[PDB]
Specification:
mainly beta, 16-stranded mixed β-sheet, binds 2-acetamido-2-deoxy-beta-D-glucopyranose, binds 1-thio-beta-D-glucopyranose, binds alpha-D-glucopyranose, binds nickel (II) ion, signal, glycosidase, cellulose 1,4-beta-cellobiosidase activity, EC 3.2.1.-, pyrrolidone carboxylic acid
């Protein structure tokens, strides 16, 4: 896509800490940028909208390449339109923001400069952050995660992307998302189908695949930590059902693992570890520090709340695994007990570790779930299963919860606050 400037693009500042062996940390002057899908797109250098509602303009966008030549991305009013504000090392993402239109959530990337995403190499290192999930009810997901995106949003590989990282281009994840309007310097117009249940979104003929490490997908009720390997580490474009994922007739027909080797303490039999109030080890009405440590043998997790360190609880009642670590043993035992082969089919932890040994971009987001109402995270899922089915119970939310239209009307002032990001070698951030 091109760049237009009727709305200025200024990346909100966000400080974070880089820590080194010894425990010394220094402040880093980062910024955040909104993902390109959220932007107004119109004719370059001016003219009609190229996309409006959930349909493309056929005149401006008769095919994928022409559309990218004729259409530009605009700047974003971060607070007024998208409900994104920063203060020092704190980032707030509001749920429903009404200005011209109703906007629901946002996806942001941490920047090293105004034209480059920050790239984190996770293996042998740890990532720590503080979060307030107190205003995240059933059906919402405040997510912090890593994806194997290009630092420049694809600009050097795809010269028809003139917007680059400055405008939040180049997203990919292990779902191989097809809802993206621009992928690899081309629009996603050919075969585009508008969503049945969402006036603002649709599903294109292409998706955008890459490795994904979901550090944190959570609300006040449940949380999950999930590696997703892909057969190619970095970004590749997929077509239709061969993207796999939720919007494809064969979930497992692609090159990425859309399921992941997920660790949700509730799903693994600990019903008192994480929840609202003093009945829970980690009280979701109060700030939580979440620390995640990556090594070749596995991923480890601890939490700090009110100065108290709590290690990840042991898996409880999971046949053949009594640890608290995402390692090859756990991932295999999970597949055996709960079903499925996707994670190991796509190379498992060995293949994930290849992405963890290269740069990944930090994503901070808030969303609700049109496909499955976040029931996979915080309720009983699938709907045909019940709490006696192995792996079915993931949280205490009602199976009727999380319908986007309902949560948007009932809980519009929901929000997530991420803060005090720290990164460095294992043992260095605490
Ligand atoms: C849940 O985790 C807590 C905190 O680690 C632990 O004390 C408790 O024993 C765990 N519950 C079960 C059923 O294992
Ligand atoms: O799609 C057009 C629409 O996009 C949104 S994102 C803009 O904020 C608005 O001004 C414009 O009319
Ligand atoms: O409303 C803000 C923004 O939302 C997204 S959903 C629209 O596609 C864009 O035109 C505008
Ligand atoms: O797509 C929804 C949800 O599906 C589950 S299977 C994945 O583990 C998670 O990362 C993703 O956000
Ligand atoms: O939660 C793990 C995984 O469960 C399966 S059953 C869901 O369909 C998917 O979105 C995710
Ligand atoms: O893809 C862009 C769209 O993303 C989300 O669905 C937002 O709720 C909407 O406002 C826009
Ligand atoms: O397709 C994904 C679903 O299938 C798996 O085998 C699991 O049992 C279920 O929790 C999910
Ligand atoms: Ni194609
Ligand atoms: Ni119980």
């Amino acid at each position: 896509q091109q760049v237009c400037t009727t709305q200025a693009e200024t990346h909100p500042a966000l400080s974070w800490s880089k820590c080194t062996s010894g425990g010394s940390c220094t402040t880093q002057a980062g910024k955040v940028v909104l993902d390109a899908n959220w932007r107004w797109t119109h004719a370059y250098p001016s003219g009609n909208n190229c996309y409006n509602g959930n349909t493309w303009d056929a005149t401006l966008c008769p095919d994928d390449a022409t559309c990218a030549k004729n259409c530009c991305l605009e700047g974003a009013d971060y607070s007024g339109t998208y409900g994104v504000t920063t203060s020092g090392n704190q980032l707030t993402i509001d749920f429903v923001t009404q200005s011209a239109n109703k906007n629901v959530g946002a996806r942001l990337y941490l920047m090293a400069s105004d034209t480059a995403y920050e790239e984190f190499t996770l293996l042998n290192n740890e990532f720590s952050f503080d979060v307030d999930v107190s205003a995240l009810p059933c059906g919402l997901n405040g997510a912090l995660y890593f994806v194997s995106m290009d630092a420049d949003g694809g600009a050097s590989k795809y010269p028809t992307n003139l917007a680059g990282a400055k405008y939040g281009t180049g997203y990919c994840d292990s779902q191989c998302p097809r809802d993206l309007k621009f992928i690899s310097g081309q629009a996603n117009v050919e075969g585009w189908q508008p969503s049945s249940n969402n006036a603002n979104t649709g599903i294109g003929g292409h998706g955008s695949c890459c490795s994904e490490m979901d550090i944190w997908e959570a609300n006040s009720i449940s949380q999950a930590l999930t590696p997703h390997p892909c057969e190619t580490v970095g970004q590749v474009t997929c077509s239709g059902d061969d993207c796999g994922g939720t919007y494809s007739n064969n979930r497992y027909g692609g090159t990425c693992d859309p399921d992941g080797c997920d660790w949700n303490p509730y799903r693994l039999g600990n019903h008192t570890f994480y929840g609202p109030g003093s009945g829970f080890t980690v009280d979701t009405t109060k700030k939580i520090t979440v620390v995640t440590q990556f090594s070749s043998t596995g991923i480890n997790r601890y939490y700090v709340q009110n100065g108290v360190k709590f290690v990840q609880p042991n898996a409880s009642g999971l046949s053949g695994y009594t640890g608290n670590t995402i390692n090859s043993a756990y991932c295999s035992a999970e597949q055996t007990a709960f079903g499925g082969t996707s994670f190991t089919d796509k190379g498992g932890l060995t293949q994930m570790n290849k992405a963890l040994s290269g740069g990944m971009v930090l994503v901070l987001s808030l969303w609700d779930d049109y496909a499955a109402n976040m029931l996979w995270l915080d309720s009983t899922y699938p709907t045909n299963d019940t709490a006696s089915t192995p792996g079915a119970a993931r949280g205490t939310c009602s199976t009727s919860s999380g319908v986007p239209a309902t949560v948007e009307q009932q809980s519009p002032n929901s929000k997530v606050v991420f803060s005090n990001i720290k990164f460095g070698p294992i043992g260095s951030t605490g």
